[PDB]
Write a protein that binds this ligand. Structure first.
Ligand SMILES: Nc1ncnc2c1ncn2[C@@H]1O[C@H](COP(=O)(O)OP(=O)(O)OP(=O)(O)O)[C@@H](O)[C@H]1O
Ligand SMILES: Nc1ncnc2c1ncn2[C@@H]1O[C@H](COP(=O)(O)OP(=O)(O)OP(=O)(O)O)[C@@H](O)[C@H]1O
Ligand SMILES: [Mg+2]
Ligand SMILES: [Mg+2]
Lengths: 488, 50, 166, 365, 524, 46
């Protein structure tokens, strides 16, 4: 019974996407894949992955396709191993699903090997100790919550707050120019977004079907059943590990959205017959994330820079899924709906953001000192804003008003038009260098730019852009005063 | 009913060697006619309260 | 002639002649639309020659359908087809395409539309056919003589407290 | 015609609170069927049960309309041949009834000529009125600012101290005076003190003329009754109104006081059956339960039934599921304020706080 | 040659809408998600959906129809097929239910309701616009064919009217252009009131939209099974046209009640409740629905199903679980604020919160010119709110123009917007904008007061709509005549009408002018 | 005041929803862990 290739069982219960299978020769090992051989008028294959052992013969499993037209006492055959995915440089420039099958309707992959989706995470001795700054080109991200090369990054946000836009901006700024390889994992996201990304990559020739490509696209979207959405992340992560280890190549792993992974496990758990935890998530919420996140790390062989989008249901950042994810992130970026409603994009809430490389030993001393000063004033303004709400601005001290004015300029300044949101913003995108941001924010704190109008900092790049929008605003005032004189 | 049961028996290949026994049941609903169920196959030739 | 590829790069059949034959064998011009639909469903993107045949059917067909359809218009149907060819399929209409539009305006008697098409052909095409221009003017004069130059409900004068706001 | 399950005998299998399981040898009757506990038991009132669920081909779970005290197991139960039957006709005018359609007024036999089942399917889509029509109540405020919709639901927000009783009585009198339609009042979870006061007042205004002709029926499922009764009294009153709407083609007025107690009663019943409550703690079938009631209140091609339901907002939270679900079925809103009453304005109606959907030129002139 | 059916077992328990079936020892057996038929009477049947196959053979059914006639101990037959409903062009102009049965109204292709959505390489960006007929929603919130656009609002804020009217606005277009480009429509009513359905049906019939529209009704009185299943059947009927190169406009009214129905069925099955007592897979309920709406690729024909889900909030709260889930699936949202609606500003589209994520690429060239500038004019207007600058004046006029009752023809809407954008309405008082628009569209002052110089550009030529849509109003061909007629119309209006309206003092005249404005506001 | 009364109502509704679930998840453990079947014992040996 050591090898179970071809072992025959029969369906015994179908609760939904959860199917029990009885093998009379012994239930195959857990995480083993099984194929429903019996043809029952279906249009697609049915593969069930074992998730539990109920007895010496029975085993509960989750289906990676729909369980329609499946009857009890239907023949199931073991595949002889876990679900496996193609890996190698042949996968580059291709679209895959959870099962490793190509969905781009182009041709055979021709991979030299297939590797299992489920694998052990790197050990302590294999962890890396390199700390650098991944310059994104976004002022708020670069200054206050700098991203770390080879470090986990999380974008917490609500519905329609800007998670996807930021990821696309990062892909344009970093991934396209990245020498190493990239893997885009789509988990419970719109299928249209995947289509746009594939076309965008081919235009930038990051996916040269007639040449050499540098991006793999693994997609299991909302339409897919809960079983597929749970395992799609493992499949995509499997390819990234291969590039990191077997080739020692830098990898960029863009996961959108990691929350759906936890949701999918929750949906199946309710069917598996588990007592729910708080809110209704599965009791193994923490364990599932830990196993998945621990594999997303940079070892002594290679480096994986992972950017993961996190969805916060009903804007409850204390929700068990997003709340557990914070501990598994080097960099955190929290987006707030109220900030977006005020016209500030990106809607990053700097006070609730944090970074691991916000350390003078890593970033420049000036960078650390300026970043700390900005957050200190953004903390003062929040306290002052509580007084301002009820009484008013005029009920503040003379120096308090100065702090309010500087803080308001800082808040406006943090906004930036992205090159991907030109349609929404109607303005050309900006790419602010790290040095320019540091020097520009230093002056605003010093008070050197206390004579510039407030709205000159809104939707701009560096301080050069600030001082040009101010000029245009002043000139436009001459078309409102000269016209006034003409009218008078 | 016997004729219908025999015809249904003939159609079923898997019951080729099985012998057709008839068991009568009183279905409270039907008012006129009958119905025959054999190995899952069900033929209704009955009516109810109009 | 050569390989043509779609959005993602998959090739498309270029033998549009068989479908053009079908279009030229249609009685009512709403049947030609079904052929175009079948062409796309079969991965055979229409080309300019096909559109010209379709515009010819809209001009030579007795009606849209066997039964009358309220507020049907050949001119509107043809203009929409050109918009699809220009703004969505990215194919520039040729002179023949506009000639059919001008012919319909002359045939229908919509002289005011004919004026706009005449300018359109001159601006984009190498002028407008002389016969159609003269025919369009002839229609305008007959309306002018008959007092039909404009809809007459508009000419009736009304003031502030007279308009019925209907 | 007669249903085959009439006279069917069964035995009380299980008793818990107001929930009783009855076993029938020949088969459980259809759901919603009414059964009578023939066993004597030395009780003071007869015990009626209503099948709500089928546990197996022979066992059925029911809710008792009266107290289930002194009910032993194996007690004989006889089916009544259908759902609860309520008397309908012109003989019920000026009379008080309960869920079971029994005259609790001690004023002689009803002498009805026909009875109807409590549970009746709502009018089909083909029976809906051709066009919306206004209901002339005769009141200047209502007819002008918040006109009533024939076959619509009107939420009468306001408590005691604003003249709600007089407005109700005035509407009952005006509708009969103008439209020649009758009225049915349904006290769901009503304080028995206030129910008595209404009957006495209606006799003084002669909307209930004991020696003459009355123009109002009363159906009182007061608080003291178990939840199984407070969840069906409204349907019983609705059934009476439906008779006048269809057989007579009138434009009836159905008052329900309150509609929140109907939600509360049906919530308690669901809890007794063991169903998992939804958010806040209401039954999972909250939307369906109201829908099966409100949808039966509409203007058909024969007549119409315009309902004036008194709405109570729990904890003054307008987003609570109960009022929130109720508002989705209200066609008009009539708000009564004490401040207006204290100023000497009667009826005390806040014109700017009321609303109506037929306030559109497409409907009204 | 008998019409043999397949008996599987007998009804055992009936817990409201859900039910259970005990197998008959040694009988064929049933499959998952298939449709079973309980024999209520020797000739009549009631439908149920298989939801759970248990270790003991007991089947878990969700009943759909005739639930009052279902009794324990009744035989159950098996169809052995997933629910297939009648679809095609023979179902248009009809009122049906989720099971495909026709609903009588007072005076043979089959589609599977469990089909997967198109894949990544079988889609394409939206390029063809879908006009809603409202100036605000077509300029500032463009919608394309193949897009999912949510309509979020409070109760009685006009969520249905803006959508049902969009189904009406397509009547004129469908009658002129070739039928291939016609936008057939499906209106799925989920949990609404039967009275509302009748009113909507008669409203559609009045404008003759039934020829291009079908209704799928599941009233509140109906059980949860039909409500839970209605949108899936509705989109299935729409997928028939998508797979054949045609376009559809499936509308759902509304997904909020569907979620309630699904929650009811889940709780009656005793499943772990989630946030707000909703089941964990409520998101997947809407995911598998809205994903089936797409803009198929040219290789697949180029069809489309445009989705207009509707969602109800409480006290303008857009942070609810269901509301956020749908917002996380759709490609944009139209927010109908309660305050604006109660303030007389209808349809009350909150442009500040509304957005379209993929609809800009669909907007026609003609509207894309009048919109980009309108974006700046209104953006400044909000910030500014007595000094009245040019942006403030134009912004106020635009807000007045957005007030609509019925959908506006494309030519009429774009022309009015262009006139306001170029300052032709600066001298016109705000309260008189509607009367100015009515004269511009219906009447013609240039023809009236004998001062007509244009040759073709007159607003009575309804065929110019497809020339304005092809060349853009800012074209050398149509721009010259457009300015002339606008200048003449503005000059005549200021000379004759506004001057008299400014010289009205008599109380009777004031009432006469007041009622004139009301009739103009309700009619263009 | 209107923003705080809105959150108070939203907090007294979430509270009742989330508390009834807690007490009804335990009811399923004490009920779903009531092992049953056909007990295989030497019942005569008793
Ligand atoms: N940087 C930005 N500049 C301008 N507008 C933005 C920006 N980011 C987001 N938006 C606006 O917000 C909308 C939603 O953005 P996005 O697609 O990123 O949402 P999301 O966070 O992925 O939400 P969900 O995935 O749940 O739909 C955009 O269509 C756009 O209108
Ligand atoms: N654009 C509009 N102009 C004028 N009146 C309108 C407009 N839109 C809707 N109304 C009116 O507002 C009322 C509510 O409209 P509607 O039925 O569309 O709302 P809803 O969002 O569907 O609300 P409900 O929760 O009742 O379904 C109706 O009286 C309708 O005639
Ligand atoms: Mg996103
Ligand atoms: Mg609605």
């Amino acid at each position: 019974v050591a090898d179970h290739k071809g072992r025959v069982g029969h369906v015994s219960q179908v609760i939904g996407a959860v199917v029990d299978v009885h093998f009379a020769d012994g239930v195959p090992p857990v995480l083993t894949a099984l194929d429903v051989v019996d043809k029952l008028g279906r249009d697609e294959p049915l593969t069930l992955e074992i998730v539990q052992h109920l007895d010496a013969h029975t085993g509960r499993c989750i289906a990676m396709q729909t369980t329609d037209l499946l009857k009890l006492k239907a023949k199931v055959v073991s595949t002889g191993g876990n679900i496996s995915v193609p890996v190698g440089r042949e996968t580059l420039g291709r679209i895959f699903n959870v099962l490793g099958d190509a969905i781009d309707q182009r041709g055979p992959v021709g991979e030299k090997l297939r590797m299992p989706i489920h694998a052990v995470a790197p050990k302590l001795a294999d962890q890396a100790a390199e700390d650098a700054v991944l310059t994104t080109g976004i002022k708020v991200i670069d200054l206050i919550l700098p991203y770390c090369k080879g470090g986990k990054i999380g974008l917490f946000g609500g519905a329609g707050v800007g998670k996807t836009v930021i990821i696309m901006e990062l892909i344009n700024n970093v991934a396209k120019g990245h020498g190493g390889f990239s893997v885009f994992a789509g988990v419970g996201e719109r299928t249209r977004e995947g289509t746009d990304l594939y076309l965008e990559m081919m235009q930038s020739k990051v996916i040269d079907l007639k040449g050499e490509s540098k991006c793999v696209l693994v997609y299991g979207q909302m339409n897919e059943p809960p079983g597929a959405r749970a395992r799609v992340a493992q499949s995509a992560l499997t390819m990234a590990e291969y590039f990191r280890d077997v080739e020692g190549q830098d990898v960029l792993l863009f996961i959108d959205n990691i929350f759906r992974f936890t949701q999918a496990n929750s949906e199946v758990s309710a069917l598996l017959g588990r007592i729910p935890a708080a809110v209704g998530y599965q009791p193994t919420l923490a364990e599932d994330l830990g196993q998945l996140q621990e594999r997303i790390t940079s070892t002594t062989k290679g480096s994986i820079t992972s950017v993961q989008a996190v969805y916060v249901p009903a804007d409850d950042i204390t929700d068990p899924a997003p709340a557990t994810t914070f501990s598994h992130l080097d960099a955190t970026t929290v987006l707030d709906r109220a900030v977006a409603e005020s016209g500030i994009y990106p809607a990053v809430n700097p006070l609730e953001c944090a970074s691991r490389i916000m350390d003078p030993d890593v970033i420049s001393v000036d960078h650390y000192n300026v970043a700390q000063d900005v957050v200190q004033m953004l903390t003062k303004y929040r306290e002052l804003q509580d007084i301002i709400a009820v009484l008013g601005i005029d009920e503040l001290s003379e120096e308090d008003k100065l702090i309010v004015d500087r803080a308001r300029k800082l808040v406006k300044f943090l906004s930036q038009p992205f090159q991907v949101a030109e349609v929404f913003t109607g303005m050309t995108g900006h790419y602010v260098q790290l040095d320019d941001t540091i020097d520009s924010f230093s002056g605003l704190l010093m008070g050197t730019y206390d004579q510039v109008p407030e709205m000159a900092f809104y939707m701009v790049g560096g301080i050069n852009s600030v001082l040009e929008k101010a000029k245009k605003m002043a000139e436009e005032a001459a078309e409102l005063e000269k016209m006034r004189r003409a009218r008078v | 009913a016997r004729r219908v049961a025999e015809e249904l028996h003939k159609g079923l290949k898997e019951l080729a060697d099985y012998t057709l026994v008839l068991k009568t049941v009183v279905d409270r609903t039907i008012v006129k006619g009958f119905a025959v169920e054999l190995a899952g196959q069900y033929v209704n030739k009955a009516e109810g309260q109009q | 002639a050569a390989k043509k590829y779609d959005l993602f790069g998959y090739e498309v059949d270029t033998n549009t002649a068989p479908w053009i034959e079908k279009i030229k064998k249609c009685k009512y011009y709403d049947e030609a639309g079904e052929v175009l639909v079948n062409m796309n469903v079969s991965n055979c993107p229409p080309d300019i020659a096909t559109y010209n045949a379709t515009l010819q059917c809209i001009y030579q067909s007795p009606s849209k359908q066997s039964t009358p359809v309220d507020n049907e218009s050949k001119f509107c149907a043809m203009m929409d087809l050109l918009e699809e060819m220009q703004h969505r399929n990215r194919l520039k209409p040729n002179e023949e395409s506009w000639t059919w539009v001008m012919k319909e305006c002359v045939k229908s008697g919509q002289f005011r539309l004919g004026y706009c098409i005449q300018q359109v052909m001159e601006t984009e095409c190498k002028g407008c056919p002389a016969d159609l221009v003269k025919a369009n003017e002839a229609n305008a004069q007959k309306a002018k003589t008959e007092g039909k130059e404009h809809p007459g409900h508009l000419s009736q004068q009304a003031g502030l407290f007279d308009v019925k706001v209907e | 015609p007669v249903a085959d399950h009439k006279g069917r005998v069964g035995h009380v299998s299980q008793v818990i609170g107001a929930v009783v399981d009855v076993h029938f040898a020949d088969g459980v009757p259809p759901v919603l069927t009414a059964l009578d506990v023939v066993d004597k038991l030395g009780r003071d009132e007869p015990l009626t049960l209503e099948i709500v669920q089928h546990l197996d081909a022979h066992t059925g779970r029911c809710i008792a309309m009266q107290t289930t005290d002194l009910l032993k197991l194996k007690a004989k139960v006889v089916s009544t041949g259908g759902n609860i039957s309520v008397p309908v006709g012109r003989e019920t005018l000026g009379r008080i009834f309960n869920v079971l359609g029994d005259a609790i007024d001690q004023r002689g036999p009803v002498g009805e000529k026909l009875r109807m089942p409590i549970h009746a399917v709502a009018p089909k889509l083909a029976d809906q009125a051709a066009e919306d029509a206004v209901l002339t109540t005769g009141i200047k405020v209502i007819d002008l600012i918040l006109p009533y919709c024939k076959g619509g639901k009107i939420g009468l927000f306001g408590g005691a101290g604003v003249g709600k009783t007089v407005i109700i009585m005035e509407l009952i009198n005006n509708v009969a005076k103008g439209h020649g339609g009758f009225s049915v009042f349904a006290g769901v979870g009503e304080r028995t003190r206030e129910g008595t006061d209404l009957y006495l007042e209606m006799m003084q205004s002669k909307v209930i003329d004991l020696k003459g002709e009355s123009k109002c029926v009363l159906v009182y499922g007061q608080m003291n009754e178990p939840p199984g009764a407070r969840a069906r009294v409204a349907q019983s009153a609705l059934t009476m109104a439906e008779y006048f709407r269809d057989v007579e083609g009138q434009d009836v007025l159905l008052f329900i006081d309150n509609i929140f107690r109907f939600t509360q009663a049906n919530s308690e019943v669901s809890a007794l059956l063991g169903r998992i409550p939804a958010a806040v703690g209401y039954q999972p079938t909250l939307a369906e339960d109201l829908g099966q009631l409100q949808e039966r209140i509409t203007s058909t091609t024969k007549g119409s039934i315009t309902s004036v339901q008194a709405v109570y907002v729990p904890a003054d939270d307008i987003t609570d599921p109960a009022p929130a679900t109720t508002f989705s079925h209200l066609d008009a809103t009539t708000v009564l304020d004490r401040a207006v009453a204290e100023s000497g304005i009667y009826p005390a109606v806040n014109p700017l706080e009321c609303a109506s959907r037929i306030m559109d030129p497409d409907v009204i002139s | 040659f008998f019409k043999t059916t397949e008996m599987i077992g007998y009804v055992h328990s009936i817990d409201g809408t859900i039910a259970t079936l005990i197998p008959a020892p040694g009988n064929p057996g049933v499959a998952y998600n298939t449709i079973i038929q309980i024999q209520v009477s020797p000739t009549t049947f009631a439908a149920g959906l298989v939801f759970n196959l248990e270790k003991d053979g007991r089947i878990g059914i969700i009943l759909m129809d005739n639930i009052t006639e279902v009794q324990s101990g009744q035989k159950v037959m098996a169809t052995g097929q997933l629910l297939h409903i009648p679809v095609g062009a023979g179902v248009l102009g009809k009122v049906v239910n989720p099971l495909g049965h026709e609903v009588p109204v007072g005076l043979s292709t089959l589609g599977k309701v469990d089909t997967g959505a198109p894949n990544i390489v079988s889609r394409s960006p939206v390029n063809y616009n879908l006009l809603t007929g409202f100036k605000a929603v077509d300029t500032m919130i463009p919608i394309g064919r193949g897009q999912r656009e949510l309509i979020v609002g409070d109760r009685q804020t006009g969520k249905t009217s803006i959508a049902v009217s969009t189904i009406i606005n397509q009547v004129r277009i469908n009658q002129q252009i070739l039928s291939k480009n016609a936008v057939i429509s499906i209106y799925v009513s989920i949990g609404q009131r039967c009275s509302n359905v009748a009113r909507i049906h008669r409203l559609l019939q009045s404008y003759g939209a039934l020829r291009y529209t079908t209704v799928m009704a599941a009233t509140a009185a109906e059980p949860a099974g039909l409500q839970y299943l209605a949108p899936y059947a509705g989109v299935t009927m729409g997928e028939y046209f998508m797979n054949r190169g045609r376009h559809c406009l499936c509308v759902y009214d509304d997904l909020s009640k569907q979620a309630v129905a699904y929650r009811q069925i889940s709780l009656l099955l005793r499943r772990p409740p989630g946030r707000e007592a909703y089941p964990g897979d409520v998101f997947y309920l809407h995911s598998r629905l809205l994903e089936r709406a797409a803009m198929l690729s040219p290789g697949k024909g180029g069809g489309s199903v445009t989705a207009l889900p509707i969602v109800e909030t409480l006290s303008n709260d857009v942070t609810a679980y269901i509301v956020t889930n749908v917002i996380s699936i759709t490609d944009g949202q139209i927010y109908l604020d309660t305050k604006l609606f109660t303030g007389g500003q209808r349809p009350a589209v909150n442009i500040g919160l509304s957005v379209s994520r993929v609809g800009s690429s669909a907007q026609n060239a003609a509207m894309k010119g009048v919109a980009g500038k309108l974006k700046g004019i209104l953006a400044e207007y909000r910030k500014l709110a007595q000094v009245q600058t040019i942006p403030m004046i134009r912004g106020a006029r635009f807000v007045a123009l957005f007030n609509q009752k019925q959908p506006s023809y494309f030519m009429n809407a774009i022309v009015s917007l262009y006139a306001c954008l170029n300052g032709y309405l600066d001298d016109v008082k705000v309260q008189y904008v509607k009367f100015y628009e009515y004269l511009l569209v219906h009447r013609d002052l240039g023809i009236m007061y004998g001062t007509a110089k244009n040759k073709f550009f007159y607003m009575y030529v309804q065929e110019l709509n497809y020339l304005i849509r092809f060349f853009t109003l800012n074209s050398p061909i149509l721009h010259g005549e457009l300015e002339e007629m606008l200048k003449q119309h503005t000059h005549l209006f200021l000379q004759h009408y506004q001057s008299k309206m400014n010289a009205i003092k008599s109380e009777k005249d004031v009432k006469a002018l007041k009622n004139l404005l009301y009739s103009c506001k309700r009619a263009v | 005041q209107q923003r705080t009364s809105s959150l108070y109502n939203k907090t007294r509704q979430f509270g009742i929803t989330a508390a009834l679930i807690e007490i009804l998840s335990a009811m399923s453990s004490l009920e779903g862990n009531a092992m049953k079947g056909v007990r295989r014992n030497k019942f005569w040996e008793g």
